[PDB]
């Protein structure tokens, strides 16, 4: 390393965690969602910032101010639309970034998975709170439902809720909080991210066949750096095309009306990416037991590594283990549309049915599927 | 590399010490100490004090010279003419 | 000879690090209950007739 | 430090120069009288045929008994301390760590005989490999964390020393010290009935095989009389062993090990050997 | 000191003296017979009146004919009514019973 | 490293950058200000946070809201007082942390010094903006002076100012900005800090005699960890004793009056730690040339390493090089009190005198002082 400029400030040797990080040869495009999360994250914080400079947190002000942006501020309309739609284009990435996780059995990495779980669990909190900030009608009641739901806890419930509200209801001081949180909190996600990426550098990436790739490696600079850029580009359209021609399409909530606590909207739902979770809840008639499922919905992702039941990592070689997996996809997709429907006996029964199936696939079938095929191949 | 192994080379240097229990938290704190403070207070004080002294004078002098000017108008020009 | 209060104490408590931890908790427990009560009187004894606690007796329950 | 026991056998060099046979004759005169002296023997001899030819000088040249006060002896202090002779030339770095222990005649002298069998000992050249039972002979053989080490046990009149002696390369010295204090501390709490046996057996083995041959027997008889009195409790040893039980060990070693002040002495390239207040903080688990 | 410190930062977020100036004492008022209407909101709007602060619903529960005394109202109210009522949700069918109308 | 728990998560080997970091033996208490900056920094962000939850940024609201904290919020009065006074106890540390820098010649470390310079330069910006937020009288005019001063730039000046203001003057949108900045910006300081500490781990600390300490080193865990805690403790009193008995002492600005653009206060000054800089400015009659000095005031700290003129690092062994240095202390101390005085002729002349002396000491005398003593000792 003679006059290699990579040593001289030390910090650049830390920057050879990228450039020479060896990688597998064969990598499907499905591994591009590594980057496209990050860039969807950065593009927030900036566009997340220049909204803050004109926003104001007050029960009296807030809604007026958001009016004030789209009308009077030069280029003020693009930003608000990049930010909001920049949320949805964030999840649609995020889920895929889990999907690759299972179907190739990347969860075998035991630590990096977990930090994965938390890192999800935080976002769902952030992308919630902000959704209150506009203080519109669907924000007000959609605030009461989610929080007041938490009263289910047997004893400390009644106090613990009133604590967060800072009062009896969702009036001012409940707003001001949810600004100061939704502001800071992404930075922490950025903090964890540079941890969540760390452990990965020890074992390198997995690769589609589920085989130790040792004999075949490639420099990271000339090759995958382009492919991410190419990946980075297709996002923009998918972001622009949506945000530019059809603003309100995925902006499915129709309600800009200033919140009136007296009135109630006939139908009330979160925005789309939440629905299925909220759909789980309606199933259980028993209130307390109902909440647990919703909490237990995601956490099961942490228990999956205990269920690795077979002798080969991938699902690309297991037809059965592949067969079921897709049914789980439609099963979720079902839940989405279910919750987006009124609670009327043709729907009611259905959600109750799809609920059990969901767990039954993950928690029983899939761990069994691997057992048979071991027996088949004579393993 | 690793910090402690390779630091430097030293030869034939012997060290002795006691448990912290065997010995005391104050081996003649006041008696042995109070002289030690003095002999090491004076070594600096020659080098330290004088500049601050200059400041305080300026400060006092400054206020007085300031005071006479403003407070007494009939000083240089008295009220006759 | 009998062991000095410490020589007992060390063998009974500070040896097992559990107890050595536990004793600390109960210690601060009783501590704050007595300690805080004393601090008021000392302060309160300083100001007499300057607080409703004394003053309120003139008008309280008429 | 500070007792007649704290000194070299041969003494500092300067005395060797100045020493005149006046002191010798004095030293001769003082310490060679009986009861101090003891005769012994083993072999084709029986007893009688010795005792007649024990008899006449020395009946004898005396070998006297008067006083020489009594007996110049007095308990000694235990100073938890450290010493480092730091010399960076030499290839390897010795260490010895020790904690003070009881004297010759005492019940606890047996329990501790067994412990230092259990921790066992390893050396460069054994045919053991990585499959050995001694938890320090498995680990330190794996990576050769230390070239060799043995545990020693020495018991004086009123006092005894417990500790090990290990050689290892300088980059490696830390990792011994930790993995060592693992052993002593897992004994004083987590020890177990089964592992006791492999310790217990070996002692029966070595004790007996130590008695082969004329001289090793006789040599023993000599010190014993001065030590325990006449007692040569051979079969009794076994009877004293079956004393040893799980609760026996963990009540014994809880005394001398857990939360004490060690004595460290080392010889360069010591440099990485941790500063003292680490070791003292490594004797007592916080339950980690 | 830790315990005090910790409660302090947390006791701040707990509540505020201002919202604590709510919890109606008033109540008091008013309507007549039917109305309803009869709401306000005010996160509460003792009672008091007397006593009361029990409940029937939100927005001038306000009592069950104030145990036949006053209420607002005093059950029936205008379409549909105060307690039974119904006046449940949009607007049927179970009214404000319960049974005793309490 | 057999079953040493320090490897197993990798992140803990990164955490042996503390515990076994070797250090010199002899270290004066003057090196405790390494930590006490950090803790004064953390203690901000928290206490800096729980203010945000009840603060509101509006021209109409803001001042009312700060009223609302000290009055109505349980334990609301301590926090505001910890935060503000937690600023002053931050600088009084910070300067010392530079002072140790010169007088032992630590600046010989060439990179770590520079990152030191920036890391200062940022704080002075933050601890400014926040000082606007209360929107009191001394905040309003103290805002106009500092910013409008920047118009001195020959051409782009007139626009560049109006840009930041977002208008012709300091009305609303100028406020909302300075909230969203003063909120985020400390996190960046925390970002740099973990860089500024990095390079240090390569060369280890310096030590009072100015000698390579190699032969004598000590574990960092049992020893200095206590000493910092002891150091960490004495702060609290010095913080508490001030914030508790005598709130407004160092709170020298007396002005809570709601800002009226029409009125003007008779005397106008920044809070104390700024003054000397602001005192430099009044000296120069020429406006443009005046501003440069103020900018050139600090930056000279970067040029000091070029001036290392002697063969031995410390100033503990150079009486001359020590003699002057103290005069510089009073020289600063002079400037402080000078700016805190009206601009009558007894003061006027003085500041002009102390100004030149200041540079003359740093920029001429001190680099000369080392030259003579080399010649003296026969070097
Ligand atoms: C992962 C990062 C972020 C996510 C997922 C996120 C998500 C959201 C969402 C869903 C909304 C509501 C959308 C809407 O009301 O149209 C929102 C609004 C807002 N966000 Fe974020 N945001 C992020 C980062 C930030 C950052 C870093 C800031 C400040 C620097 C920020 C400031 C705001 C503000 C002020 C609003 C209210 C403006 C508005 O909603 O119209 N956000 N954010
Ligand atoms: C904001 C959230 C996230 C960010 C910024 C992020 C970023 C990344 C990046 C850049 C990589 C390296 C590229 C790659 O391996 O695909 C990665 C790997 C990985 N992440 Fe995340 N990810 C996030 C969320 C998650 C979540 C929620 C999980 C699991 C619940 C997760 C699990 C994984 C796994 C298993 C890998 C390695 C897979 C492999 O190497 O084949 N990540 N993540
Ligand atoms: C190095 C870090 C910080 C410094 C030097 C600093 C300094 C200051 C100063 C000097 C003030 C004005 C003091 C006063 O008005 O009484 C202030 C106010 C304020 N700071 Fe910070 N602050 C820091 C960190 C923070 C953080 C991290 C936050 C938010 C989480 C924050 C939020 C605020 C708010 C909302 C105010 C207005 C409240 C008030 O001034 O009464 N500050 N800060
Ligand atoms: C928020 C600001 C700062 C923080 C958090 C900080 C923190 C630290 C810490 C923790 C150390 C290690 C302990 C020590 O060496 O004393 C250090 C070292 C040092 N810092 Fe900073 N410091 C800050 C500001 C500065 C500034 C403004 C400068 C110079 C302009 C500076 C220059 C140095 C130097 C020269 C050292 C090493 C001195 C030595 O090792 O003898 N630091 N700093
Ligand atoms: S700028 Fe108006 S007085 Fe200095």
XYZ file of N, CA, C and O and ligand atoms in Angstrom, chain F residues 41 44-45 48-49 80 83-84 87 127 130-131 133-134 179 182-183 186, ligand 3:
115
model
N -22.948 17.884 26.759
C -23.646 17.837 25.485
C -24.880 16.955 25.570
O -25.973 17.356 25.158
N -27.748 18.366 27.514
C -28.555 19.230 26.674
C -29.661 18.447 26.005
O -30.836 18.588 26.355
N -29.284 17.571 25.073
C -30.228 17.068 24.081
C -31.510 16.595 24.744
O -32.616 16.933 24.312
N -32.845 19.483 26.273
C -33.209 20.199 25.075
C -34.459 19.665 24.429
O -35.148 20.401 23.722
N -34.782 18.400 24.662
C -35.953 17.828 24.011
C -37.214 18.252 24.749
O -38.081 18.928 24.190
N -36.378 24.501 31.760
C -35.952 25.713 31.078
C -34.704 26.294 31.716
O -33.813 26.784 31.018
N -31.677 24.070 30.833
C -31.260 24.171 29.447
C -30.433 25.419 29.239
O -29.277 25.346 28.819
N -30.990 26.576 29.585
C -30.282 27.828 29.359
C -28.945 27.845 30.089
O -27.893 28.035 29.474
N -26.204 25.889 28.850
C -25.387 26.409 27.768
C -24.120 27.048 28.308
O -23.018 26.763 27.839
N -25.614 27.712 19.531
C -25.934 28.434 20.750
C -26.320 29.862 20.448
O -26.837 30.564 21.319
N -30.696 29.385 18.885
C -31.620 29.145 19.962
C -31.902 30.408 20.735
O -33.047 30.689 21.085
N -30.875 31.216 20.945
C -31.040 32.431 21.724
C -32.021 33.401 21.091
O -32.446 34.349 21.751
N -34.959 32.139 19.820
C -36.252 31.472 19.987
C -37.195 32.100 21.002
O -38.399 32.139 20.729
N -36.760 32.556 22.174
C -37.724 33.123 23.110
C -38.425 34.325 22.559
O -39.482 34.694 23.077
N -36.044 27.917 14.383
C -36.358 26.768 15.216
C -35.878 25.481 14.570
O -35.176 24.686 15.203
N -32.075 25.142 14.879
C -31.580 24.920 16.226
C -31.994 23.590 16.762
O -31.445 23.151 17.772
N -32.968 22.956 16.133
C -33.382 21.643 16.596
C -32.428 20.590 16.052
O -31.776 19.877 16.815
N -27.625 20.225 16.591
C -26.757 19.518 17.535
C -26.437 18.100 17.123
O -25.328 17.626 17.389
C -25.384 21.847 21.938
C -26.694 21.713 22.093
C -27.610 22.879 22.463
C -27.317 24.116 22.803
C -25.958 24.802 22.966
C -28.548 24.791 23.030
C -28.627 26.074 23.400
C -29.812 26.662 23.566
C -29.925 27.998 24.013
C -28.748 28.911 24.347
C -31.191 28.281 24.070
C -31.815 29.600 24.506
C -31.850 29.537 26.021
C -33.092 30.207 26.517
O -33.833 30.741 25.671
O -33.341 30.210 27.746
C -31.899 27.114 23.666
C -33.234 27.048 23.615
C -33.887 25.997 23.099
N -33.322 24.807 22.743
Fe -31.440 24.350 22.676
N -29.600 23.960 22.820
C -29.033 22.773 22.466
C -29.707 21.645 22.153
C -31.041 21.618 21.953
C -31.749 20.456 21.535
C -31.060 19.120 21.243
C -33.013 20.801 21.434
C -34.254 20.000 21.050
C -34.305 18.693 21.239
C -33.118 22.156 21.814
C -34.282 22.811 21.822
C -34.367 24.067 22.274
C -35.585 24.806 22.342
C -36.976 24.329 21.913
C -35.290 25.973 22.834
C -36.289 27.084 23.092
C -36.699 26.887 24.530
C -36.197 28.091 25.249
O -35.262 28.731 24.725
O -36.741 28.414 26.330
N -31.900 22.660 22.124
N -31.035 26.109 23.352
